[model samples]
Target: RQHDEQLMTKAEQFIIASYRELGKSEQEIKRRVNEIRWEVEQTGTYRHTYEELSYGAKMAWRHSNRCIGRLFWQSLHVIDAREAVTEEEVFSYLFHHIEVATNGGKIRPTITIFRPNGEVRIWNHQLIRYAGYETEEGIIGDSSSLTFTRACEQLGWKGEKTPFDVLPLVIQVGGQKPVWTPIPKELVLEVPIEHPEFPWFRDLQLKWYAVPIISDMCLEIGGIRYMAAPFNGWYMGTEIGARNFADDYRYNMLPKVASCMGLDTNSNASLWKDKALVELNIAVLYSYKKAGVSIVDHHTAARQFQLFEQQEKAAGRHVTGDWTWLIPPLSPATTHIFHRSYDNTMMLPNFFYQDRPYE
Candidate 1:
């Protein structure tokens, strides 16, 4: 009986340890999380003393297009143990965005394709189809601030015309210069607090508000996307029972871009590894940047500080005076979700220009 009890105890220990390891969590994860949070609070103290953290029971709503909705902040933070943003850090932002967007809601919205041919359409979730969508009624509600309401009204529906019907911002290279063209005032963003096109793009990408957002960029329509996180396998419908597929696919399940784009065989099933990870990060970053926020991971950035600095300088040049708005407080509220990839991810997005409140 004593031997049997000892064996049972050992088995239980193995199960507990194995489950925790499945998450790849260790003391390192907890230490990193707390360390980053503390650094963020200190930074916030140095920068400003009058900010607020508005917490509430996250809720959902419907969109003008009859989709569900949640809060949308133009930019928010994800802290690192040391300080900075990385690909995983970006995921932290997107993941938070996804969770809040869901807000106890069900129903997966369609992914979109932003075509060069000026067609913004959504891919059907059940069957393959490219379809256009109307703005959901829930999205019609005011943003976190009053300016958003005014901006949407003024920029979106001027002279009794909804911009979506009259004008979809034409993306053309300016004067043959290698710069993105300016969105005409008519289609300039609906909510001025965020980028004029963001709500539209996010509505499509997130499908929040039930808006089927198709192609908005070649980036979206063209990337080989691999989700290293569990959400990938669960939502992406990867086959779990295959033997070869279940075994040798490592590098955090790193596969080819072809697989992610749906052009190649997804059978092998890999996450992102090395250069592939870099590309994926940039692709996601490009989308989030449009919302006017830059998320950084401290550990990853620390390894490649120069590159991170260049990115920081560039982002600051666009909107904020010094990039402080782009930089957010690295706190426990927002820390690296992927503890393995990012040690010190930071959020320092300048949202004032984007019209999001500091709170």
Candidate 2:
């Protein structure tokens, strides 16, 4: 009882101050606070109003230290699915989230917040991801997704041995056995990567899914943890080109990409790796733009983040960040975030890494 009261007191102060900042009158704020406190006393918890929820969601984004795209934090379109409890309902909502966020290639920054009743959890890292198969031929598809893929197979789910097979959605409610449902092909938007100058780039058979919807993270608002809040942002091209495709544990396409470029891979002085990496990034940017998909180049994205920093300062807010993540992977030294140090202090009302949903 004391703990509950203590929590409500903190919540009351936060909500009251937040409401004041938003121009709510003293009388109106007091009335809302009273109502919230009464509800907390009666039910042991107080639900945030729609206005408060929206503000909390935006604040969560602003507190995301790794995200370089906080410039549009206020523009995040939030979908409240707090009533959904069963796996079936959550699965359907996940598909709808994919469709709505995809928006026919003009991807939107969106988050679908599910019930925080400790009964709902998404087992997959992302709503849309390819299955990884461990075979004699070696690992195909994303190796990072192998654990969830095997879990799905144990649940009687199946997948063909392919590099690009989209994984099924794995959802678990409470202690019940998880369920797997294949995402519809129509809902997934993929761009075939090709370069304007290099026709051979198209022959690599590389493609990446649009819209990165992270599902395995926890979204905390006030003291409540929403375990199934899936959020997405449109990708920066190098995310796919530089890391996803070129990482050693991942596709490891750099050597192949370099070989195709006819670079002398035998010598370290050839700079074949660096040259190929640039073209890969170029192809990703070119293909996405040609396909009319929303993608930001690293240079442009860095500049936007700088603008966001300036705006935050003007609003008298100190920007906190993880400098390592804020800097782009391909050209870290060139970005403005590279030169500046940030306060690494973590803030609440934030999205955070949690334990994996499944063993």
The prediction achieving the highest lDDT against the true structure is 2
Task: Write the residue-wise lDDT of candidate 2 on 5-111 in tens digits.
Answer: 77676677667656865878888877887887788788887787666767788888988999999999999889888778677788888998998999998999998
lDDT of 1 by residue, 1-359 (tens): 35334433332333233334345456644543344345434542111111111010000010011111111221222111112123333323333333432233332331111111212211112111111222444222112212322332334423222222211221212122111112233211211111132333232221112111222212200011111111100011111111111223211222433234333343335432333333333333343334432223323322333343345457442211222211212221232322212212211210101112111
The 0-to-1 C-alpha lDDT of every candidate, in the order given, reads: 0.23, 0.86
User: After superposing candidate 1, which stretches have Cα over 4 Å from the reference?
Assistant: 1-22, 45-359
Determine which window of 10 residues in candidate 1 has minimal summed lDDT.
54-63
| TM-score to native of every candidate shown | 0.18, 0.96
TM-score of 1: 0.18
RMSD of 2: 1.6
